[PDB]
Amino acid sequence: GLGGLERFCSPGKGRGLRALQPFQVGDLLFSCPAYAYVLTVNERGNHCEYCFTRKEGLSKCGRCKQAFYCNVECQKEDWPMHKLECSPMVVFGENWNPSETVRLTARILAKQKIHPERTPSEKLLAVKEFESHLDKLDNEKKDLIQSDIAALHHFYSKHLEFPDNDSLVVLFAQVNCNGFTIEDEELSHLGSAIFPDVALMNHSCCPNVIVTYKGTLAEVRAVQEIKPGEEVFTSYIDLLYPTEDRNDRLRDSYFFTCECQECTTKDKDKAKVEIRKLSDPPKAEAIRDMVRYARNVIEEFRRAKHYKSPSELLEICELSQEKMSSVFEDSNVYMLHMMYQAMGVCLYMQDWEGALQYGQKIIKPYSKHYPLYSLNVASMWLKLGRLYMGLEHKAAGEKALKKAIAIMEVAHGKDHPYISEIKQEIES
Numbered sequence: 001g002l003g004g005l006e007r008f009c010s011p012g013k014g015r016g017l018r019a020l021q022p023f024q025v026g027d028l029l030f031s032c033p034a035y036a037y038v039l040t041v042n043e044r045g046n047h048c049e050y051c052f053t054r055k056e057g058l059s060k061c062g063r064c065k066q067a068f069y070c071n072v073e074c075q076k077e078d079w080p081m082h083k084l085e086c087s088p089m090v091v092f093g094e095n096w097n098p099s100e101t102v103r104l105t106a107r108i109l110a111k112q113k114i115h116p117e118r119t120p121s122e123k124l125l126a127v128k129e130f131e132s133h134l135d136k137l138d139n140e141k142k143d144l145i146q147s148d149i150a151a152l153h154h155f156y157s158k159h160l161e162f163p164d165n166d167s168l169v170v171l172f173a174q175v176n177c178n179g180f181t182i183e184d185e186e187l188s189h190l191g192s193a194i195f196p197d198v199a200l201m202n203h204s205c206c207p208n209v210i211v212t213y214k215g216t217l218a219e220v221r222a223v224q225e226i227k228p229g230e231e232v233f234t235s236y237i238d239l240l241y242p243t244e245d246r247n248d249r250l251r252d253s254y255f256f257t258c259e260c261q262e263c264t265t266k267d268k269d270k271a272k273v274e275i276r277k278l279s280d281p282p283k284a285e286a287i288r289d290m291v292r293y294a295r296n297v298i299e300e301f302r303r304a305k306h307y308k309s310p311s312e313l314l315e316i317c318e319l320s321q322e323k324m325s326s327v328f329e330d331s332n333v334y335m336l337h338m339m340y341q342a343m344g345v346c347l348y349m350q351d352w353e354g355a356l357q358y359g360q361k362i363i364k365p366y367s368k369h370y371p372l373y374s375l376n377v378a379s380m381w382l383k384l385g386r387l388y389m390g391l392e393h394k395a396a397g398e399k400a401l402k403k404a405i406a407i408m409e410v411a412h413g414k415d416h417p418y419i420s421e422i423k424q425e426i427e428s
């Protein structure tokens, strides 16, 4: 189905989505209800488990007191999926630690037993039809799937009937590369879901669509004019980084290399890796070393985001920046990576001033490096606005919040609950 769209074979790629009618900028292509979903553990007090709405003072689950809901209606409708974790959270207590993947694969198995037939989440692609890339996964990723399986058994023993090891390996591999992360208006991680039809769409570093969420509902809107017969492209990755960096990430998770206009021309590559205009210009050899150092420290930081302290993480950001500053211009995407990373640590530690100072340095190069309609730009203006408003800068506040609404009206749509919320912030 899906009015004015069709599944097809995209040459040189595979299964894709194609427009059959035109779509102007801001037009809703389709909506895909969540086949399976979960709210992340760290967002448990702030958000409803069933619809993901952000509210303070949510009703608690009487049994576990770990799940929070808008009303009894969200609580009752959530129970089929919550019963998988409700009694095991009480039994295991603070030891209850299944990974978000294990948590999601559990809901998938539950949806397979209650609704074995094609769901409205599966109008053009089925979960069972998902790519698993099992032939391509290393020993590390296969060991984590074995680990995931043991965790599923250890934490969901009492509420599920499990298929054999081989069936569960395929499913865990499938979820790993097909699972969607859901973010809020600020790009903060909210949870994980299965959107079978959204997963049909192929990748481009110049996308003509963006995926946003209305609670657990995924929404696909046009960010470029789409003509009948043109293929529908979303971006699988973060479009801030140069071509090699994007293709390295693409190969890592989806084992394919990109061939779009941006990957071909590499026009934004020189500007993304901006170099200081020194009287003695740094040598190509020195430019090479700083790019490697940066890519190395980016990996070092992600790993450190597990064991090192927020004040330790900041030292890495600050010293990495200071080191890179020898060759890299402040608009360089590697500098910007660490500025963003320290902003997140500042927002974490509630250093609203430190965060605001990062954002201010981040936003002009962001609108220069990302496309016009980009969730990273809108969420950065939204974060700047909210911080400005919090620190008594109303003129700079309304200015940044309006700039967020501008992009967001096109991505999230003019009637989105987010736009209203932000408007209430300017008005009241």
Ligand SMILES: Cc1cc2c(ncn2C2(C)CN(C(=O)c3ccn(CC4CCN([C@H]5C=CCCCC5)CC4)c3)C2)c(N)n1
Pocket: 012, 013, 014, 015, 131, 177, 178, 179, 180, 181, 199, 200, 201, 202, 203, 204, 235, 236, 237, 254, 255, 256, 257, 258, 259
């Ligand atoms: C050569 C080529 C092939 C291309 C392609 N474009 C898509 N192809 C495929 C046919 C190959 N595919 C896969 O290997 C492949 C595996 C799982 N999937 C589906 C995934 C669903 C989840 N999203 C993520 C997106 C955003 C952030 C949150 C995390 C979730 C990522 C996608 C695609 C699709 C392109 N430009 N070139």
Ligand SMILES: [Zn+2]
Pocket: 048, 049, 050, 051, 052, 053, 069, 070, 071, 074
């Ligand atoms: Zn609710």
Ligand SMILES: [Zn+2]
Pocket: 061, 062, 063, 064, 065, 066, 067, 082, 086, 087
């Ligand atoms: Zn409960």
Ligand SMILES: [Zn+2]
Pocket: 204, 205, 206, 258, 259, 260, 261, 262, 263, 264
């Ligand atoms: Zn590309």
